[PDB]
Design a protein around this ligand. Structure first.
Ligand SMILES: Nc1ncnc2c1ncn2[C@@H]1O[C@H](COP(=O)(O)OP(=O)(O)O)[C@@H](O)[C@H]1O
Lengths: 411, 113
């Protein structure tokens, strides 16, 4: 009933609500207002789809909570699958197994995809009979339209004897490797041809390629065993070999997107590394967000805009977001209520908009569900103004809890 | 309404039967003898009188080429294209379900008498 992914703070975001000419609509695809920033993000999304330009960085700034991360999630949802979109918080690079620069270049390489295509003949049918003569043997496969016999090699007959030799199993035989995978007791049987030539397409990232080709049992990308990949031979040779796959009909590179959320956590070292990582031909496009104004860069006492050094700020473009008004706040709250299973009255929406414009926007978005659950307690159907007031009284907010501190606590 | 008279030659699956090894070998031998022959779709007595006085030495017997080293390729019997499949009944090969159906309708166990 309930899946892993549930309703969240950005679940309503289905993508950028732009037209064919990159013109944002008033309220479309769960994105309200923020026209300037949305049409400025559509441009970077389009040139990302293009991919001819490498190493572009677009920063988004403004008041805290002005859809800064919503625009990034919308860009991700519009880019869709088959195009890596790696979102990472500014702290995720601080690691003990890897240096900060190594983690940042790891993310840069994860944000680059390599497309490869191949053909493979695959079998899928129901087993009928098996024979083994201690070694060589025979097998009988069946589908709803045909049956056939096969004289199996030693390895194949052994892999089949590993299972229940009698009929019932519906297996698949990858003729390339021959790995068997019984779907179940014949789940129904397959239709059409028993053996068919299937096209296989893979979007494998450069980081995955490095992890695969760096060590025996190289696929340590499931627990982050890639401690300090050797740039001397691994990464340079992988770049050369990818360039060789290119322009030869073997593979084509698909530049991804890197969304660094809360980049003000990064340090002068990470910024200096980016200064050159954004200049390589394999450099992906990235976006970044910040809530602080002119603050100190972590590492020294230098006060710089966005906490980002000037030599890097000159290397990117900036997009300012405007504060939301009553209309935008009310429409965002309505979209949140439509995403959720709650329904409010018009006066309730007005009161919630006033409460979300007095203190802040996220407060109302959070009070939505609380008021829903409180109205569900009195055995009602719609969230009313009295329930919203009950919630406004029960749960406090930043500005009303910082003022209640008329009694001294620890410090 | 026009009553469409159906056929009564359908055979019961409970009576349909699989084939064996000797009969398949005889099928192959007959097909090869027919390919070697030339008439409507004798030298048998010729070769009988020949083998009547044959021994081991520099003759046809020790002169025949024999089987090759490269393994037999699984060619189709209906269309002739590469056939990764086989007929569970008689062992004939095919490449598509259409070829299998044509074999079952025209070749499968109908000529063995
Ligand atoms: N234009 C918009 N359309 C729809 N929802 C929005 C919009 N702007 C903000 N929101 C919602 O309001 C909340 C604002 O928080 P957010 O902008 O993510 O803060 P920050 O980006 O500073 O971390 C988010 O949950 C977001 O889903």
């Amino acid at each position: 009933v309930t899946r892993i992914e549930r309703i969240g703070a950005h679940s309503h975001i289905r993508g950028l609500g732009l037209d064919d000419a990159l013109e944002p609509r008033q309220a479309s695809q769960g994105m309200v207002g923020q026209l300037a920033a949305r049409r400025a993000a559509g441009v970077v999304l389009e040139m990302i789809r293009e991919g001819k330009i490498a190493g572009r960085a677009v920063l988004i700034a403004g008041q805290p909570g002005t859809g800064k991360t919503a625009i990034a999630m919308g860009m991700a949802q519009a880019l869709g699958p088959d195009t890596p979109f790696t979102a990472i918080a500014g702290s995720e690079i601080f690691s003990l197994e890897m240096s900060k620069t190594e983690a940042l270049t790891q993310a840069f390489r994860r944000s680059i995809g390599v497309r490869i295509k191949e053909e493979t003949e695959i079998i899928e049918g129901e087993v009928v009979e098996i024979q083994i003569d201690r070694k060589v043997g025979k097998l009988t496969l069946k589908t709803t339209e045909m049956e056939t016999i096969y004289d199996l090699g030693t390895k194949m007959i052994e892999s089949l004897t590993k299972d229940k030799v009698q009929a019932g199993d519906v297996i698949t035989i990858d003729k390339a490797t021959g790995k068997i995978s019984k779907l179940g007791r014949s789940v129904q049987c397959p239709d059409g041809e028993l053996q068919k030539r299937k096209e296989v397409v893979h979007t494998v990232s450069l980081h995955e390629i490095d992890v695969i080709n760096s060590r025996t049992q190289g696929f340590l990308a499931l627990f982050s065993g890639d401690t300090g990949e050797i740039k001397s031979e691994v990464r340079e040779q992988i770049n050369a070999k990818v360039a060789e796959w290119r322009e030869e009909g073997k593979a084509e590179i698909i530049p991804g997107v890197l969304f660094i959320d809360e980049v003000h956590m990064l340090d002068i070292e990470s910024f200096s590394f980016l200064n050159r990582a954004l200049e390589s031909d394999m450099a992906p496009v990235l976006i970044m967000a910040t809530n602080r104004g002119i603050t100190r860069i972590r590492g020294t006492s230098y006060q710089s805009p966005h906490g980002i050094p000037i030599d890097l700020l000159d290397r990117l473009l900036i997009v300012s977001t405007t504060p939301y008004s009553e209309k935008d706040t009310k429409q965002i709250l309505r979209i949140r209520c439509e995403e959720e299973d709650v329904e409010m009255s018009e006066d309730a929406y007005t009161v919630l908009t006033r409460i979300g414009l007095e203190t802040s926007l996220r407060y109302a978005i959070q009070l939505i569900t609380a008021a829903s659950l409180v109205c569900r307690k009195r055995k009602g159907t719609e969230v009313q103004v009295d329930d919203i007031k009950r919630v406004y009284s029960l749960f406090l907010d930043e500005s009303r809890s910082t003022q209640y501190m008329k009694e001294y606590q620890d410090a | 309404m026009v009553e469409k008279k159906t056929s009564v030659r359908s055979q019961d699956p409970g009576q349909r039967r699989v084939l064996d090894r000797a009969a398949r070998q005889r099928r192959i031998n007959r097909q090869l003898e027919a390919l070697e022959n030339d008439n409507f779709q004798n030298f048998q007595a010729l070769l009988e009188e020949q083998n009547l006085s044959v021994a081991e030495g520099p003759n046809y017997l020790t002169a025949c080429a024999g089987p090759p080293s490269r393994p037999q390729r699984p060619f189709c019997a209906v269309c002739g294209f590469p056939s990764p499949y086989t007929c569970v009944s008689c062992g004939a090969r095919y490449c598509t379900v259409r070829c299998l159906g044509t074999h079952q309708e025209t070749r499968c166990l109908k000529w063995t008498v």
